[PDB]
Write a protein that binds this ligand. Structure first.
Ligand SMILES: [O-][O-]
Ligand SMILES: [Cu+2]
Ligand SMILES: [Cu+2]
Ligand SMILES: [Cu+2]
Ligand SMILES: [Cu+2]
Ligand SMILES: [Cu+2]
Ligand SMILES: [Cu+2]
Ligand SMILES: [Cu+2]
Ligand SMILES: [Cu+2]
Ligand SMILES: [Cu+2]
Ligand SMILES: [Cu+2]
Ligand SMILES: [Cu+2]
Ligand SMILES: [Cu+2]
Lengths: 281, 277, 281
């Protein structure tokens, strides 16, 4: 697979729901909200109309990074694009291809790893919403972008991964050789440094080197702060083989307190070498 | 609207002065000091002799990032290039173009988004003088760089933008279609994440991709730490139209405590849709 | 002087973990010669390194590496039972690969870059104790044709110290104007830092050096960094600025104020640094 040229006009329904544990989630269907919210994938040029409904007892909003949107889809109290309790609103996101402007410069596409989150709960910056779990990924693909066997979203939200209690992963499974895509988002108050054992990627738009003349740095550790978003694709177990490969924040008290999960890379027979589930507790 | 080749020897007078309620700033003429300090632009290859005068009762200095300067223009007490009270000094900053060295490798030029600040007030690293307002931006352009319709300078200085009180901006104005340049400098103790609503830029030298071969990440949110500086040009309203477009620090307590302003992009008739002055 | 050659050799080294004075711990290649930072390990892409490792201490220790290819048995984590018991021995194997075109048409990133190793088991199962105590070291993987330097120096921001040195005690590095000097910068611990050098700059890419006039990497003199970040650059000492006691420091204001400063002592050909008086520093 490779992404095709874009330009489809899409629609979807989206709800903001209270979840258990005092949380809040987005979902595509009533009663199916998740944390992180649902992954929205677009190709450059597609438009997405989001038929949005607020099912909670407090205003909420939908603010997106990186995608074209007019002020009316800003998703803020400050230009009256929030959604009252029980209210509804259609947010529109647009994307565009890159190309030469008439002044000679190059307009950058919308392609990239982006995200969306609340901007209204708690404060007019969505501090309460984001803490509760109102966030999710948006991938915009360029025509020709290689496509992954799977996509996993890792959000460092304050001292949590995906709002989970400490040392509860999440874990992610792949088989040696799968092309795995990772979307990494950070939210909240703290900086973090995302690290993956056994695996590395290029610090560019795709996480993959364009070819032999890409000078981007190849890393396995990146500092990130609130609302940063990047992603990459790795071949699971490439050059290293199967195993329970940790990913964690490398800030030493963060990993000690539980900002750790496993990238479980399995042999073809589905087993994991030297993976004693209880030696990782 | 493109930068020319440099090589001109330029001179400017700068002054350090005190300002109201504890603050201090640089000025091009006395009485006229500002926080941030004056924007300095140069073309790669230019030399700049800053004829500097400290009008304050305490020592001060002028230290610059990225530009060429000999150790005597270090702007540090450590190297004895600070400026005593009432004193004067001439700091020389030079720039160069990119080109191939003798050893055959490529030497990077001076072009970039840079800044200058005090290095001796409060501490030997400027801690009290940076806190007080003693910082400013420097742009060095390469030959061929497209020139903006405006440049606006945003300094995250601890928990403030441009040492301004919380929730007071600043706001900048443009018209849809304007090529707008933002200079972003961070100072103090805190990390930040700069975010702009409705607009995006490439994470490279200019903030614009070189072309279809430029693999630089395109972003709208950037982590920055003390003495980081970067800049970019955007077409205002490009693909998103007019309106009051927020920029802020995206650390949640920071934006909550007031690290937020507006990029007011106006329709050619001058009105901003949706905006509530 | 010159270029990195093509890799492919299988190298062996003995490495030791040893107690050092002051409650510190260090790696070394020979007994009694442990250092903080540990020894610089240098490989070319394709090289294999069998580290014959010995733990001379009374507590468990491990060797974990960033960026290189290792199988999960050389993870160096208690979690995967690749730590070394007090008095114990273990051969860690690190591999590197050249970049190249995969059968799927994408470009495989090579191992080349500025990497580091460190402990993963001392104090906590994320090595928080052994990293505090000085168990960390640089690794450089060179791509064929990489420019070699006249000298390489390693600067590790470890918590609020540089190379575990007392406040304001450097270290200092000396070069002559025109020397090609390689800096390897690693960060560790709990804190974010910004690395700054007076009178010098580099490219934010793999080598630190612009590949040519087509390379768009930002050129910087100041770089935010977090725990386990590792980058490097080569500069021409004093190029366009002359001899001098050029400070490098973390630019987080209170960090420099309280010790995170050192000196790049760049000398004229006659050995002099005019104006340099250590008592003013
Ligand atoms: O506000 O993101
Ligand atoms: Cu916002
Ligand atoms: Cu963290
Ligand atoms: Cu690791
Ligand atoms: Cu945001
Ligand atoms: Cu901030
Ligand atoms: Cu936003
Ligand atoms: Cu500075
Ligand atoms: Cu680890
Ligand atoms: Cu620091
Ligand atoms: Cu400096
Ligand atoms: Cu300095
Ligand atoms: Cu590590």
């Amino acid at each position: 697979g490779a992404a095709p040229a874009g330009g489809e006009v899409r629609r979807v329904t989206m709800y903001a729901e209270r979840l258990a544990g005092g949380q809040m989630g987005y979902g595509l269907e009533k009663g199916k909200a998740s944390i992180p919210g649902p992954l929205i994938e677009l190709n450059e040029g597609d438009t997405l109309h989001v038929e949005f409904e607020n099912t909670m007892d407090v205003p909420v909003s939908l603010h997106v990074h990186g995608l074209d949107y007019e002020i009316s889809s800003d998703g803020t109290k400050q230009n009256k694009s929030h959604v009252e309790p029980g209210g509804t609103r259609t947010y529109t996101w647009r994307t565009h291809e890159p190309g030469r402007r008439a002044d000679g410069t190059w307009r950058a596409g919308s392609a990239g790893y982006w995200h969306y989150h609340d901007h209204v709960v708690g404060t007019e910056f969505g501090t309460g919403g984001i803490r509760n779990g109102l966030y999710g990924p948006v991938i915009v693909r360029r025509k020709g972008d290689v496509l992954p066997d799977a996509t996993h979203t890792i959000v460092f939200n304050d001292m949590t991964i995906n709002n989970r209690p400490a040392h509860t992963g999440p874990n992610f499974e792949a088989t040696v050789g799968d092309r795995v895509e990772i979307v990494m988002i950070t939210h909240g108050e703290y900086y973090h440094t995302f690290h993956m054992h056994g695996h590395r990627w290029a610090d560019n738009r795709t996480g993959m080197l364009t070819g032999p003349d890409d000078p981007s740095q190849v890393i396995d550790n990146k500092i990130c702060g609130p609302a940063d978003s990047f992603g990459f694709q790795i071949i699971a177990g490439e050059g290293v083989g199967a195993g329970a490969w940790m990913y964690h924040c490398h800030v030493q008290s963060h990993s000690d307190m539980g900002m750790v999960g496993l990238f479980l890379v399995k042999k073809p027979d589905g087993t994991i070498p030297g993976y004693d589930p209880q030696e990782h507790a």
